[PDB]
Amino acid sequence: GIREKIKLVSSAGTGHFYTTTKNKRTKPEKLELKKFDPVVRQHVIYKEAK
RNA sequence: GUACGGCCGCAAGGUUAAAACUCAAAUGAAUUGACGGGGGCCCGCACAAGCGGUGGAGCAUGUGGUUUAAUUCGAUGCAAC
RNA sequence: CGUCGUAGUCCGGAUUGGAGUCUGCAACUCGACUCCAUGAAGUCGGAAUCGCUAGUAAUCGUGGAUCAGAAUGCCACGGUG
RNA sequence: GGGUGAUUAGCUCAGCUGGGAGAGCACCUCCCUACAAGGAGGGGGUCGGCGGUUCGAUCCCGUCAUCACCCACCA
RNA sequence: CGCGGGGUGGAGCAGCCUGGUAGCUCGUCGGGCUCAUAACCCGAAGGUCGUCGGUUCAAAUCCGGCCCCCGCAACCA
RNA sequence: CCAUAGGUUAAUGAGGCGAACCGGGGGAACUGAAACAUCUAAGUACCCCGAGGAAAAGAAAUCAACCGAGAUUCCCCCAG
RNA sequence: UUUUGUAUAAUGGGUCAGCGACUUAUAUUCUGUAGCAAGGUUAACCGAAUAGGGGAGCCGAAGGGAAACCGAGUCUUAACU
RNA sequence: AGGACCGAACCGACUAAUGUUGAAAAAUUAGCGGAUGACUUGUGGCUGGGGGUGAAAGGCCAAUCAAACCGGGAGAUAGCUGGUUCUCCCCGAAAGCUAUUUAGGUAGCGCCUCGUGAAUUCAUCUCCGGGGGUAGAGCACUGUUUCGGCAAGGGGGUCAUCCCGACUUACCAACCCGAUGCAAACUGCGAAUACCGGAGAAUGUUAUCACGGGAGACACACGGCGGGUGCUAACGUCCGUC
RNA sequence: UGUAACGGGGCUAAACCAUGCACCGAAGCUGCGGCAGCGACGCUUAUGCGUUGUUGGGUAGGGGAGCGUUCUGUAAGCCUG
RNA sequence: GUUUAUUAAAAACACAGCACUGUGCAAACACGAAAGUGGACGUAUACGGUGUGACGCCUGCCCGGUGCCGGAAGGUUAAUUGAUGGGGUUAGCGCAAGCGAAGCUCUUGAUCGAAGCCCCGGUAAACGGCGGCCGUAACUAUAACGGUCCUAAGGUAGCGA
RNA sequence: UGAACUCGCUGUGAAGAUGCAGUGUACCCGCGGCAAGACGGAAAGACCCCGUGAACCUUUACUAUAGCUUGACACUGAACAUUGAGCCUUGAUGUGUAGGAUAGGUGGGAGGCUUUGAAGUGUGGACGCCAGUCUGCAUGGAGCCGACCUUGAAAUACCACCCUUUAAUGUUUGAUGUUCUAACGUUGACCCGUAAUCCGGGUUGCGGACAGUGUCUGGUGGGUAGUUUGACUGGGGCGGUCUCCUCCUAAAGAGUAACGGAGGAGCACGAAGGUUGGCUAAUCCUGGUCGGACAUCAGGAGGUUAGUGCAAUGGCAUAAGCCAGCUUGACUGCGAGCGUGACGGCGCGAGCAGGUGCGAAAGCAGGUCAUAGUGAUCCGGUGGUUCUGAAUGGAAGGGCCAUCGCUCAACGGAUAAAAGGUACUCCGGGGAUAACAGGCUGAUACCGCCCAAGAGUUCAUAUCGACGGCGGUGUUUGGCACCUCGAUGUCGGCUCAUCACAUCCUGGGGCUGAAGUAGGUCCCAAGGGUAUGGCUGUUCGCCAUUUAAAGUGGUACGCGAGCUG
RNA sequence: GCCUGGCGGCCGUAGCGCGGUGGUCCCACCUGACCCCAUGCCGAACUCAGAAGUGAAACGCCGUAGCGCCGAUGGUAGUGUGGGGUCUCCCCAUGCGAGAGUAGGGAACUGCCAGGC
Known part of the structure; x- marks a missing residue:
């Protein structure tokens, strides 16, 4: 809500x-x-935000 | 040196100019103090600047204020506590 | 000489009871001196301002007056300067 | 008549959580000095009438009395 | 009609909005300068923050009631 | 100065009028969009000019798609 | 005629007479009906102008998926289901 | 001499009367306002519509003007006011639930019917049963409130900050408790009826379902009962139910 | 406006009431004369009949018939000076 | 003097007078697709315009807004020009999809550059505008005076229901 | 000019009846006069509302543009200076500074060069901070240098190489400022047309590179055009309302009304999410140094009373409330499926494929106790992509799959997007919508009674009267919408009626707080009679006065085919 | 037959209060702990190695009704369906109908299993 x-x-x-x-x-x-992504399907490591 | 009309003047104003009401002055010449917020001569440490301060704490002693039945009068900076 | 600090202190002992000591109708209230105990304030201090020129300022003891019985106030004395 | 305020000393007005009356002026007395002015002490209270409550109404409620003000035909 | 503010030791307003918290210039009395009051510099005392409550750990402010004030204003059968 | 502006004359053409279509210039509003401003209505209505039997268009600086067609125009389809 | 509602002063009617409103195109679709039927149809053109000629075009019997692509299936999907 | 006073011609309107199907879409009478002037008048010309002309009135521009007169676009446009013409039979509605750029426009659903098919279709009544939470009832609980009991807190009054503060009061008053209660937004609880399903007894000039054509309908009136609403007034307003 | 608030006349039980019995009163109840339409049962037909039941106020709307008239044809006809 | 031809006849408009201002002449200004006119056969005691209204008393303040007069340093900023980066193609590289120079070429838009705008003084006979609360003087009262909030000014003179 | 044979009254009444109900009354008709009625006659009515009306008018409503104005460009040239930017040709800049020493900077560092040349004291020209450089004679005639020591970021043979500022010569360019002149002008003259009131050509004088104009462009722009100002507001309006969400109204079947009742939402938390096992308030009492004051740890009472991200509501330990450990399931595709609405839309979920987490395991985990935290379509850009890409090889483009973005909030988005005036008003609706006579109502007003604390000497009631109760008239003023806006004309002035009686006067009785006189009051009675001025439009009111008395209400608050304005 | 425990089926007539009784099987307290497991400190809690001591407490069993709880019967409120009466209420005919109170009840029911005496 109104956030970046x-x-x-x-x-x-x-x-x-x-x-x-x-x-x-x-x-x-x-x-x-x-998080999960339906391509490699072995979980993805997500980084660098806020 | 003034209200309302004349007379002049663009106007102001000039010109003509008193009374009612009312009070101890109004006015010209000189003089003794006081005194600068004048200018000069003198003076006090006033100035210059030195060594020491009060007010706060504790304690003691006076003066005023205020209340109540009493909580005294005088002093009025220095020239009173 | 011994001893001690930036600590409201070794201190101070101002205050509050209990004991007494003195003088005196009488010290409860307003007096002084004493002891065992307890125990607070004071580490410059308001706007702003005070005072004299050397034995003067500054500072510590001694004496007297008043007086039955107490001053730190009153009048004097000398030391350090 | 209605509405909004005021209604405390003669003339004008502050109060107080209901304990109790007050100042200026006047009518007086003393202090300061002959007075102004000032300080102090007094004289006089329907705190408006009548009800509700309370042991008590400046600080309450109703209903009145009077004053200043406002209300209103024509739209 | 309808709308927008103000009420803060005695007086008149900052403060509030942005929460870690009660004030300024005067006033009253008492000082300092003085022979003395002003002008001026200091010292001291006192807030139902209109006022009853709400809300919160917490205010005068958040916020409803009960009153007192002003400004725009009555510009429609 | 020769010339030429100006002036004179002859020969021929243009002018004006006409029904509709047409070429160049100028060109709406209402209407529909359930409002309304882009869009639509519509280059229509109407006004100016010119011209022909028609105007326009024309004998590929055409397309087409690596395969081909072979000036223009009008009608039917392509295709709502 | 007009509104929930009309004895209604609520609009319309002097009287006769003459007049006074669904006509009409195309594209499409359903419904009815009829020929023909997995078929049914031609446009413009021009003609023995209601016949006949003219298959370019049109609809119908296949659908699913942006599309590539597949097909009585297809897309979705890890996948029969 | 005269932007003076009188006054006929001429020009112009202060009042009263006449006239507006009047003689007339501005003329008439009786007293008049002016009358060498910023006068008035005969004649012709020049100025044109979103433009003229005006000591400048939406005045004047030929009866006409917030754009005149004539024609064309034009058969403008009108969710609106209206105009539509012999004899007859069968079946027979709706005014509820919603949305809108929405208010006398429009639209989804809803009942009626024509076609074809199915059907003891469908409902009354009984038996069995579910949600119930109104009518009513209750008072622990949520709010609220009358009269009392015990007793904090607050204002008022006095002394304090030592006792972990008491004392008091012709105010106000909590927590809890006894007597008594009210309730849509409370629940210790809780109908008649209504609805719909399961099954069954009884029955019919058909009750209904499904698919395909046409729809039609929401401006509603009056009055009880249940309630809001107004004044438990209205020939006044909103809603269930009849 | 004029009685006007028994509808008028007129009232004394012609008002009011208890209980009972009779009476008037429509398209309802009972009948007579008709038009169209329909269920059950039984028989019969390229469709009716009997026995026995039984319906017809209708706007919106949906469905389905009847009469008249213009014109052309029917019409070189038919009717007729 | 002028007027709404038929509801107004006037205090309105005009007008003697006035201020402020534009205009140096091929004037400013007006007509208007643009010439040629009109201003004017005038030339600064000439011409244009606004408002107020002859004659006598005279005629204050606010430059915050907005416009006009004047000013140019600093900043925003267009046309123009086409830096750098993405793409195509081409030389290049490798076993490949793909990567990858100039020039050609599309694209992005660096830099360049004015007025107005952001600015600042004058101007209100330029438009336009020009205050509340409270205290205070020998009963009552009032307030010349003061306190205070506040503004671009707080509306002077005169006249005043 | 419906028909008519059309009487008066009371009531009913789409509520103002000749025609309905009840009832009363009346010879008929010309003719001259008078004039209440036909909501009389003339008018597609003034005022109000409404309409996705109409024009004209205004501008902190919306948008654009002629014009005016800024710059770029050209028609448009010459020269120089003023200053650059660009630029030719020949030469030149160089020391900062310590000791010797004028080292420009910089890369390289024993090898390398001159004979048209240096040497040395003499003259002489030039650059010069005087350290030296450089041409060239007098003049002769191939050398010469460096290493180590030494200054300094850093050396001094020798070579590659970069730049400053500028004269003179050559010069591109936009301006500034003069000058010149062929451009251009003449708004001068002259010559001729013309012994022409147009201006054409020519020659001259004087100006002079501009005016003017078109393309680009910034600014401004009512002069000119086109447009709107949403829906509801128990007539119009000020304020309110428009989307989502709880408890209640809402009818013991469901959605749900009236400007109905108590409130909220446009977000929050990466943790406040997932999960294993546990835990259990609050409040008050007791007692414990530094302690104003709530302070600690333990005991007791006690509990659907604590808490729940936020609002209202329901629930609560099988905790959904909080405590420790570990964690991403704030998952991707789907799904036994099941709900709710007319539709768009929108709520729940067992389970499975892939992967994950907590747990011993069962089991649970695709967010939160839960109901709200919302924003399509179309589109400006963007990663992935041969899915496709108009001749085909590329790209650009179209699509798919990831994606950023509206307060369109008037929320279901008529449009990213719009306010005012009209008494010049016009046009069409509407009484389906206002004040107005009538009706309904009687809150309001006016008025009667009941009750009667108190007033009034005593004393309620002679004359008054509280706090309250029960009613009356239509009689003021409010409420309704039932008749009107398809004409039913208003205030004051005035000639003129008539009915009612809550009676002003007389006529008659009773009481008194009535001795007489004179007043106050009550019920009983309707016959006549019931006044004049100032100011003002006045009704009225105030002021000034009469009469035996100068009363009140009803009649469309009687009285414009009655007059006056 | 009775007892003690459990799985439960059931969870307001097993509840509140009041008076007795039991260690045998069982359980609770309880013995001990740096051993498995553990305290954000504590063997309290939860373990692990168990019987020395009890029945304090908790727990079970049993009595006792003042009550929660259970509760007739009748009436009342309420009411479907017809109708009466100047009528938002009253009255009736017919068909239904509580809650609360009263009489009275009442100190739990019951199936399976192991062990005890």
């Missing part, structure tokens, strides 16, 4: 970028959670 979008990059080759809207108004720390 930034997409996470994959540490490897991936066709998707997970879109984060993470609040950075009290937490400057990075978000790293792992």
Whole structure:
């Protein structure tokens, strides 16, 4: 809600970028959670946003 | 040196100019103090600047204020506590 | 000489009871001196301002007056300067 | 008549969580000095009428009395 | 009609919005300068923050009630 | 100065009028979009000019698609 | 005629007479009906102008999927289902 | 002499009367306003529509003007007011639930019917049963409130900050408890009826389903009962049910 | 406006009431004369009949018939000076 | 004097007078597709315009807004020009999809560059506008005076229901 | 000019009846006069509302443009300076600075060069911070240098090489400023047309590279054009309302009304999410130094009363409330499937393929206790992609799959997107919508009674009267919409009626707080009679005064085919 | 037959209070712990090695009704369907109908299994 979008990059080759809207108004720390992508199907590591 | 009309003037104003009401002055010449917020001569540490301060703490002793049944009068900077 | 600090202190002992000591109708209230105990304030201090020129300022003891019984106030004395 | 306020000393007006009356001026007395002015002490209270409550109404409720103000035909 | 503000030790307003929290210039009394009051510099005392509550860990502010004020204003059968 | 503007004359053409279509210039509004401004209505209505039996178009700087067609125009399809 | 509603003063009617409104195209589709039937049809053209000639075109018997592609199946999909 | 006063010609309208199917789409009378002037008048010319002309009125421009007169576009446009013409039979509606750039426009669903097919179709009643949460009832619980009991808290009054503060009061008043209660937004609880399903007894000039053609319909009136609403007024307004 | 608030006349039980019995009163109930239409049962037909039941107020709308008239044909006809 | 021909006859409009201002002449200005006219056969005591209204008293403030007069440093900024980056093609590289120079070529838009705009003084006989609250003087009262909030100014003079 | 044979009244009444109900009354008809009625006659009515009407008018509504104006460009040339930018030809810049020492900078560093040349003191020209450089005579005639020591970022044979500022010569260019002139002008003259009131050509004078104009472009632009100002507002309006969400109204079957009742939502949390096992409030009492004041850890009472991201509501330990460990299931494709609405739309989920997490395991995990936190279509750009890509090889382009973006919130998006004036008003609807006579109603007003604390000497009621109760008239003013806007004309002035009686006067009775006189009051009675001025439009009201008395209400608040304005 | 435990089926007539009784099988307390497991400290909690001591407490069994709980019968509120009466209420005919209260009940029911005496 009215918050800045930034997409996470994959540490490897991936066709998707997970879109984060993470609040950075009290937490400057990075978000790293792992997500599923239907191509390699062995989970993707997503990094560097907000 | 003035209200309302004359007379002049663009106008102001000039010209003509008092009364009612009312009070101890109004006015010209000189003089003793006081005194600068004048200018000069003198002076006090006033100035210059030195060594020491008060007010706060504790204690003691006076003066005022205020209340109540008493909580005294005078001093009025220096020239009173 | 011994001893001690930036600590409201070794200190101070201002305050509060209990004991007494003195003088005196009488010290409860308003007096002084003492002891076992307890125990607070003071580490410059308001706007702003005070005072004299050397034994003067600054500073520590001694004495007297008043007085039955107490001053730190009153009048004097000398030391350091 | 209605509405909004005021209604405390003669003339003008502050109060107080209901404990109790007050100042200026006047009518007086003393202090400061002959007075102004000032300080202090007094003289006089329907705190408007009548009900509700209370042991008590400046600080409450109703109903009135009076004053300043407002209401209103024509639209 | 309908709309927008103000109410803060005694006076008149900052403060509020942005939460870690009660004020300024005067006023009153008492000082400092003085022979003295002003001008001026200091010291001191006192807020139902209109006021009853709500809400919160927490305010005068958030916020409803009960009152007091102003400004725009009555520009429609 | 020769010339030429100006002036004179002759020969021929143009002018003006006409029904509709047509070529060049100028060119709406209402209407539909369920509003309304792009779009539509519509280069239509109407006005100016010119011209022909028609105007226009024309004998590929055409297309087409590596395979081919072979000036133009009008009608039917392509295709709602 | 007109509205929930009309004795209604609510609009229309002097009277006769004459007049006074669905006509008409194309494209499409359903419904009815009829020929023909997995078939049914020609446009412009021109003609023995309702016949006949003219198959370019049109609809129907195949669908599924952006599309490539596949087909009584297809797309979706990891996949029979 | 005269942007003076009188006043006929001429020019012009302050009042009263006449006239507006009047003689007339501006003329008439009786008292008049002006009358060598910024006068008035005979005659011709020049100025044209979103433009003229105007000591400048949406005045004047030939009866006409917030764009005149004539023609063309034109048979403008009108969710609106309206005009539509002999005899007859069968079946027979709707005014509810929604949306809109939406309000007398339009639209989905809803009942009626024509076609063809199926059907003891479909409903009444009984038996069996589910959601119930109204009518009503109750008061622990949520809100709320009358009268009392015990007793904090707050205002008022006094002393304090030592006791982990008491004392008091012609105010206000919580937590809890007893008596008594009200309730749509409370529940210790809780119908008659209604609805719909399961099954069955009884029955019919057909009750209905499904697919394909046409639809039609929401401006509603009056009044109880159940309630809001107004004044438990209205020939007043919103909604269930008849 | 004029009685006008028994509908009028007129009222004394012609008002009101209990219980009972009779009466008037429509297209309802009972009948007579008709038009169209229909279920059951039984027989019969390229469709009716009997026995026995039984329906017809209707706007919106849906469906399905009848009469008249213009014109052309029917019409070189038929009717007729 | 002028007027809404038929509801207004006037205080309106005009007008003597006035301020402010534009205009140096091929004037400014007006007509208007643009010439040629009109201004004017005039030339700064000549011509244009606005408003107010002859004659006598005279005629204040606010430059915040908006316009006009004047000013140019600093910043925003167009046409123009076409830096750098992406693509095609071409030389290049390799076993390949693909990568990859100049020039050609499409694209992106670096830099260049003015006025207005952001600016600042003058101008209100330029348009336009020109305040509340409270205290305070020998009963009551009022407030010349002051306190305060506040603005671009707080509306002077005169006149005043 | 429906027909008519058309009487008055009371009531009913689409609520103002000749025609309905009830009832009363009346010889018929010309003729001259008078004039209530036909909601009389003339008018597609003024005012109000409505209409996805109409014109004209305005501009902090929307958009554009002629014109004016900025710059770029050209028609448009010459020269120089002023300053650059561009630029030729020949030469030249160079020291900062320490000791010797003028080292420009910089890369290289024992090999390398001159005979048309240097040497040395003499003259002389030039650049010069005087260290030296450089031509060239007097003049002769191939050398000469460096290493180590040494300054300094850094050497000094020798070579590649870069730049400063500028004169003179050559010169591109946009401006500034003069000058010149062929362009251009003449708004001068002269010559001729013409012994022409147009201006054509020519020659001269004087200006002079501009005016003017078209393409690009910035600015401004009502002069000119085109357009709107949403829907509801129990007539119009100010304020409110428009999407989502709970409890209730809402009818013991469901959606649900009225500007109905109590409130909220446009977000929050990567943690406040997933999961294993646990845990259990709150509040109050007791007691414990530094302790104003709630402070600790333990005990007791006690509990669907704590808490739940936020609102209202329902629930609560099988905890959905909080505590420790570990974690991504805030998953991708689907799905036994099941709901709700007329539709678009929108809620739940067992399970499986792939992968994941917690757990011993069962089991659970694609977000949160839960109901709200919303925004399609079309489109400007963007990664993946042979799916496709108009002659085909590429690209660009079209699509798919990832994707960024509206407060379009008037929320289901008529459009990214729009406000005002009209008494010049016009046109069509509407009484289906307003004030107005009537009706309904009687809240309001006016008025009667019941009750009667108190007033009034005593004393309720002579004359008054509280707090309240029960009614009346239509009688003021409110409420309705039932008749009108397809004409039913308003205020004051005035000639003129008539009915009612809550009676002003007389006529009659009763009481008194009535001795007499004179007033106050009540019920009983309707016959006549019931006044004049100032200011003002005045009704009215105030002011000034009469009379035996100068009353009140009803009649479309009687009285414009009655007059006045 | 009775007892103690469990799986339960059931969870307001097994509940609240009041008075007795039991260690045998069982259980609770309890013995011990740096051993498995554990305290964000503590063997409290939960373990692990168990019987020395009890029945304190908790637990089971049993009595006792003042009550939660169970609760007739009748009536009342309420009402479907017809109708009466100047009528948002009253009255009736016919068909239904609570909650609360009263009489009264009541200190749990029941199937399977192991062990005990």
